[PDB]
Design a protein around this ligand. Structure first.
Ligand SMILES: [Mn+2]
Ligand SMILES: [Mn+2]
Lengths: 433, 433
């Protein structure tokens, strides 16, 4: 039974307020923190901010914190639900909310309590959190994931010209998670050396996710840079590349992608319809070891999505397309729009729904890549989530900034706990379990 | 009694390996991680890296980890010392090391175990860590500190032209720690807006400590920028400025400071002897609300240090000068070289010595500013240390990057625990207890 639930305001990796929940059972205190979130969006669960631009730039969360403390807390204490009843507790809170997008209480309110209940539940049962998640998802085995280290930024998370949002490396050819961390950090540093040389020391500063953001023009330039770091590190053929185009941002008029790559007059110099953008992807695919591409098109450019998924043998990740929403996932499944779900727990709002989102996708042949948010915290929960859900692939930042390393370090501790019989997804990252 | 001690390698906020120690007593597991460190230096305790440039760029720590596991661990388990005997445990390890700078076992080896023992000791006694530290240091009361948020970078931590290393803001005029976090983040954001405007979006990327690093020329430019953010935020007169000149880096020939501010030929354009540099400081002091200056001169320019300390009424912080070393502190005390110790626990190597370093300084009228390292971890130990040592002032990064916010968030949780009777150093930050 829950003896106490108390939320407080803490600050995320970007300097903005966010919710932190303390939950008590006779076993003790269980703490969880909530990452980023859409303060308003039309597909994902709404994180409740205050909007008073006077206080914290309209980003405070005293409201979400209050909904937890004086609404969720007393109600769930009297509900008599045990932390061992994840689905029931999550269900209760949603009922309590009434809205479909958790707009009454706030998804950040619900998720914080939901995450805390999960950690408490694993403690009630006397098992580590990754095991409790596996059991909730019906897995008998867990597996160490392949990390997708964001290393070069553009579009967002940083701001130059480079329209493609993320360029990541994936040590698919690593023998273990330890070895993948080594391959990952070494390349990261060698890449720092390269960017410093090619663009000067000042270009080695980092964006929200710890990745460099040199003033590069063509996306291909980014890939070449990465390709050099891998060679320098001597990891050619062990590391593959991954992308997140976030194409929804530059989708302009009908069938037109652009953004002028952040140039109010770069127009025409990038008057490329989806098919031209799709061809461009294929060139990259044969020229670089690109194994996964996220959001190649706008979240509503369904037809170019299906075409690309049908015509390639690489992973096509749905982020803005699916929005961790089972309704969106279902449509994307019917349309064969993609073959991978980017799992962002705060997008849906609870642990139970997040797990169901993953099982849906997995049931329909998809892969699942667990994802952090731009605004993360020191909470390392998704590290246990990715191991527990046996997805084999996590995207939680470059190995720089501790809100990122908090997750990676935790997966290494888990690895150490699994012993010699710890399995690393590796080349089977797309669907290892 | 210690039933088990096991170290492992984890990654710091910069992507480099560092030591993490797990310590067990019948009360459970107590974990601590070690930050940055001088892999070799002549004044501070030496952190042991491996040097094999093939592995992790010569930065691995399997040696330090091994010294813990197969040397420190069995020895301290059989020693029969209790975690409640901080001084004895720390003493034992130093004996065990034999060297003066902890070069046999590695300061990173010793400090990790030392930090873990401290957390275990507070648990043995049933009190929070900040209280256990207060009691170790003989304090009856604890006090919430004034945060020194590094916001603009130069010299190191980033790399432009700006030779002065750090420019920080200090909400000395805040009513509480909560209010100081608000004042701190708001200014940080307003400053992001300003830098974006004046130098473009790309200039808002951050360095090792979460602070922006625009390509500014004159240090005065940095101060003006900050001054604008404070005005925009509407906090003029509540926030003061702090600096860390790290002058040791640009100290060239006899009585000559320069660095050409990172220009192989900026020579002459900054042929300034100490006295010219000292005058420059005074101009800043009357023109901007500068309350504290760290390392105004080279760690051996003793005479210009004394002159400056004697002639001003602001805080003069010794970082490279003192190196958390009681021998250096003693000399600086005799010479009246400064009036504040920057406390970096890993510089000295143990909790006991760190506490003694603080008491020495405090006994001689100095202030103590607890400091993080460039390469931090998600460990929030120094947050309890600064509250416990009643220093009233901590320098743990900009409110950006979670290895920084881990500390700030922890001080807010402590604040919440102290209740209404929680005292905030504020204007008395220099020596509040
Ligand atoms: Mn995306
Ligand atoms: Mn310094």
């Amino acid at each position: 039974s829950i003896t106490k639930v108390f939320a407080r305001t803490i600050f995320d990796s970007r300097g903005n307020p966010t919710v932190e929940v303390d939950l008590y059972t006779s076993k003790g205190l269980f703490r969880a923190a909530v990452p980023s979130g859409a303060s308003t969006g039309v597909h994902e669960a709404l994180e409740m901010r205050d909007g008073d631009k006077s206080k914290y730039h309209g980003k405070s969360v005293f409201n979400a914190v209050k909904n937890v403390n004086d609404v969720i807390v007393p109600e769930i204490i009297k509900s008599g639900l045990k932390v061992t009843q994840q689905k029931e507790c999550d269900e209760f809170m949603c009922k309590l909310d009434g809205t479909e997008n958790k707009s009454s209480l706030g998804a950040n309110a619900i998720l914080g309590v939901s995450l805390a209940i999960c950690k408490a539940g694993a403690a009630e049962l006397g098992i580590p959190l990754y095991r409790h998640i596996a059991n909730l998802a019906n897995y008998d085995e867990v597996i160490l994931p392949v990390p997708a280290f964001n290393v070069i930024n553009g579009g967002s998370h940083a701001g130059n010209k480079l329209a493609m949002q993320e360029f990541m490396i994936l040590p698919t050819g690593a023998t273990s998670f330890t070895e993948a961390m080594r391959m990952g950090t070494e390349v990261y540093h060698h890449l720092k050396a390269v960017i410093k040389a090619r663009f000067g020391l000042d270009a080695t500063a980092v964006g929200d996710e710890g990745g460099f953001a040199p003033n590069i023009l063509n996306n291909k330039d980014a890939l070449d840079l990465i390709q050099e770091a891998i060679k320098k590190a001597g990891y050619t053929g062990k590391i593959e590349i991954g992308m997140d185009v976030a194409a929804s941002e530059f989708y302009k008029q009908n069938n037109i992608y652009d953004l002028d790559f952040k140039t109010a007059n770069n127009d025409g110099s990038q008057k490329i319809s989806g098919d031209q953008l799709r061809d461009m992807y294929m060139e990259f695919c044969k020229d670089f070891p690109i194994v996964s591409i996220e959001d190649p098109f706008d979240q509503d450019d369904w037809e170019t999505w299906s075409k690309m998924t049908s015509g390639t043998t690489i992973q096509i990740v749905g982020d803005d397309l699916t929005v961790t929403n089972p309704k969106r996932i279902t449509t994307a499944v019917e349309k064969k729009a993609c073959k991978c779900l980017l799992l962002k727990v705060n997008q849906i709002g609870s642990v139970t729904e997040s797990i169901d989102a993953h099982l849906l996708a997995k049931k329909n042949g998809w892969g699942t890549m667990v994802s952090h948010r731009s605004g993360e915290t020191e909470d390392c929960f998704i590290a246990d989530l990715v191991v527990g859900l046996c997805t084999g692939q996590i995207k939680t930042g470059a190995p720089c900034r501790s809100e990122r390393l908090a997750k990676y370090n935790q997966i290494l501790r888990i690895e150490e706990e699994l012993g010699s019989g710890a399995k690393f997804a590796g080349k089977n990252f797309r669907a290892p379990s």
